[PDB]
């Protein structure tokens, strides 16, 4: 079936909260107003509608560094003190898969990733794995 759609208005700081292709989660006021173009298109007193936005989240970016709390940072930095943190992270990738420890290790290294750099300001090399 064809999908339905709605227009939404972002104001002030909510602009640039999303881009095309973003699976957003939008809170807003469902607002309606008279529209003569829709009236002549439908032949009835049909009112256009738009969502006056009040919050935009994303359903893939469920966590972000701009939302991390001091307690989250504290427990993260406490976990890093453990000498088993590498093994814990490797065991934590796809825990419902038995074995494949080398695969989990490689995927952890790719998931965290290296550091991009540009020595001399003239020669780029990627950081991603």
């Amino acid at each position: 079936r064809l999908p339905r759609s709605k227009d939404a208005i972002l104001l002030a700081d909510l602009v640039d909260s999303c881009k095309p292709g973003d699976e957003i989660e939008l809170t807003g006021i469902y607002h309606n107003n008279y529209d003569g173009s829709l009236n002549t298109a439908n032949g009835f007193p049909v009112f256009a509608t738009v969502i006056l936005a009040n919050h935009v989240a994303k359903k893939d970016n469920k966590v972000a560094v701009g939302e991390l709390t001091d307690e989250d940072v504290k427990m993260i930095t406490s976990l890093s003190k453990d000498q088993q943190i590498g093994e814990k992270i490797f065991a934590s990738i796809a825990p419902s898969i038995y074995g494949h420890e080398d695969i989990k290790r490689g995927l952890a290294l790719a998931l965290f990733g290296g550091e991009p750099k540009n020595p001399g300001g003239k020669h780029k090399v990627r950081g991603d794995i």
């Binding site: 881009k19 750099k117 020595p119 001399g120 003239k122 020669h123």
Partner: protein, 605 residues
């Protein structure tokens, strides 16, 4: 109101005294009135503009600088009028034919750190802003009225010298003298200036992750017109403002430009002295070769070929009108992971004009030129592809083997004739494509497989002939080279933190770029007579060798050896001479050209 006129007069007087009194220097050496002398020399040259630095204005009178930052639209008019009267008292008396005083455009610049397009929120409206970007489109110059005179259509009364507001905003004609719209604008009795709209794309460094690059409309005025072309990188100082002719209370925004800074051709005499010294010192060729891609270990002959490509030969127009290309076309076939793409990414950065394209990401129209319908006019218009955007420069086609054959066919005219002939949609022209093609590709079988021979190349002979030099850069395993290369790579990765210091026996990238531009515009060499004799004889021996190899194989070689290769050697020698700013190519220059082409010909054995 008299109080308002008093305020305007006081601010104009303060700007006048800034332009009259500002000095640079010290009592230990001396003083020069910077803006007085700039006004005098520019007016006597007929330039009628100056470039007032905001930092200098702040040092003289901080309140004026703050007012000009917060309210530039109000105060730039006063500053321009102040500059006009200062120019009058500085230049008069003037000779015959120069009695009438001319208006002065006060451009301005700043040392402040720039903002960005996505940083331009609503609170920046009507303020001075300084943003970087790339010009992607440039309008043709059009006339905008600065003062008009309007005549009543019925009774022929006239209102004259009505001041038009600057920028894209217009003026409302009065509805009282007669009819409801009594007036028409007199086309003769009005004064107009050049204006030009541009589109400034956000810097690729500045685009946030996952976003498309934004772009901003610019308005350039008077002497800012044609100061920048598409493909240039600029810092634009201007006034963020609304156009003033879905939703209701919305107005489109643009930047009224008042200062353009090309972030990277008029060289200073000091820079010219430096370039002449560089051309004069004996090992400039090796210095340039070391300066090209200094982070890339080895590949010194390929770097030398890239040097010859960057400097290029000399275009020649012969008595019958036929033109010979000076540009050098360089193909780099070979194994993967061999810094070919990095060398292309260096050349794009280093060439005075440089355009980087992926072969797989390109199309025939997008490379040469596109014909598209203008949405606002219904006519078909021309759009420059990469080879037009790179005219007078280098095209870096990476992953060149991934193009479809019909798209590689499109560049045949532009590679050799250096023109793009178009006959589409009723518009028929011959654009210029005076550019060098630097291409990179991998073997047919991934790595170069020596057992399969000529099957490692899928390119046609016709397009292979158009490349001046063809490198088959094989990746040959060797423990000593591998150890030294790995040490170089690891130290390079460690050196990402050490302040970007320079190196002995090397030219900085910016200085090398400017030196290439200087040598390109200045020097066009030729061959010496005995050098031409040597090249003639060696060409005969080379052609005989190629013919005998083809006969022994009983198969035509993939890479041909033709008159284009002779002329390729000619223009390589001319490029080597142009590095040294010599009017002639010696036997040694031809010898180095033969050596480079022999490396590129062993790669075709």
């Amino acid at each position: 109101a008299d109080e308002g006129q008093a305020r305007k007069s006081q601010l104009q007087r303060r700007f006048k005294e800034f332009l009259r009194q500002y000095r640079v220097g010290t009592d230990r050496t001396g003083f020069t009135f910077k803006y007085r002398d700039e006004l005098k020399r520019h007016y006597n040259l007929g330039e009628y503009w100056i470039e007032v630095e905001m930092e200098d204005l702040a040092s003289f009178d901080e309140d004026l600088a703050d007012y000009l930052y917060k309210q530039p639209a109000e105060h730039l008019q006063l500053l321009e009028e102040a500059a006009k009267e200062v120019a009058d008292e500085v230049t008069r008396p003037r000779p015959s034919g120069e009695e009438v005083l001319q208006d002065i455009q006060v451009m301005l610049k700043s040392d402040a750190s720039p903002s960005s397009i996505r940083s331009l929120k609503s609170d920046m409206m009507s303020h001075l802003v300084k943003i970087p970007g790339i010009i992607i489109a440039a309008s043709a110059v059009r006339a905008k009225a600065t003062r008009i005179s309007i005549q009543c259509r019925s009774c022929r009364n006239t209102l004259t010298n009505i001041a038009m507001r600057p920028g894209l905003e217009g003026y409302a004609l009065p509805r009282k003298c007669c009819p409801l719209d009594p007036y028409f604008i007199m086309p003769d009795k009005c004064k107009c200036v050049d204006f030009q709209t541009l589109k400034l794309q956000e810097l690729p460094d500045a685009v946030p992750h996952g976003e498309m690059p934004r772009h901003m409309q610019l308005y350039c005025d008077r002497y800012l017109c044609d100061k920048v072309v598409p493909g240039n990188r600029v810092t634009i100082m201007g006034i963020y403002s609304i156009k003033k002719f879905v939703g209701v209370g919305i107005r489109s925004s643009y930047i009224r430009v008042l200062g353009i800074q090309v972030d990277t051709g008029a060289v200073s005499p000091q820079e010219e002295e430096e370039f002449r010294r560089l051309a004069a010192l004996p090992n400039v060729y090796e210095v340039i070769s070391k300066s090209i891609a200094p982070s890339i270990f080895g590949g010194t002959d390929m770097k030398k070929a890239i040097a010859c490509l960057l400097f290029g030969g000399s275009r020649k127009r012969l008595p019958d009108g036929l033109t010979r290309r000076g540009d050098i076309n360089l193909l780099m076939l070979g194994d993967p992971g061999t810094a070919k793409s990095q060398l292309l990414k260096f050349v794009e950065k280093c060439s005075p004009i440089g355009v980087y394209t992926s072969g797989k990401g390109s199309s025939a129209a997008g490379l040469t030129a596109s014909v598209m319908r203008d949405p606002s006019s219904r006519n078909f218009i021309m759009e420059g592809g990469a080879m037009v955007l790179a005219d007078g420069g280098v095209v870096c086609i990476d992953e060149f083997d991934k193009m479809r054959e019909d798209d590689r066919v499109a560049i045949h005219e532009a590679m050799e004739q250096q023109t793009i002939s178009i006959a589409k949609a009723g518009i028929t022209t011959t654009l210029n494509s005076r550019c060098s093609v630097l291409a990179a590709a991998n073997s047919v079988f991934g790595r170069w497989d020596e057992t399969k021979g000529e099957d490692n190349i899928d390119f046609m002979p016709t397009i292979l002939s158009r490349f001046d030099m063809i490198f088959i850069v094989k990746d040959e395993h060797n423990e000593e080279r591998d150890v030294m290369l790995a040490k170089h790579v690891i130290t390079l990765h460690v050196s990402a933190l050490t302040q970007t210091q320079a190196v002995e026996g090397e030219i900085d990238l910016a200085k090398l770029k400017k030196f290439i531009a200087y040598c390109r515009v200045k020097c066009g060499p030729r061959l010496s007579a005995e050098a031409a004799e040597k090249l003639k004889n060696r060409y005969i021996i080379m052609r005989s060798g190629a013919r005998q190899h083809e006969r022994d194989s009983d198969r035509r070689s993939s890479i041909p050896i033709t008159v284009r290769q002779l002329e390729a050697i000619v223009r390589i020698a001319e490029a080597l001479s142009k590095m040294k700013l010599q009017p002639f190519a010696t036997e040694a220059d031809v010898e180095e050209a033969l050596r480079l082409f022999q490396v590129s010909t062993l790669d075709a054995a």
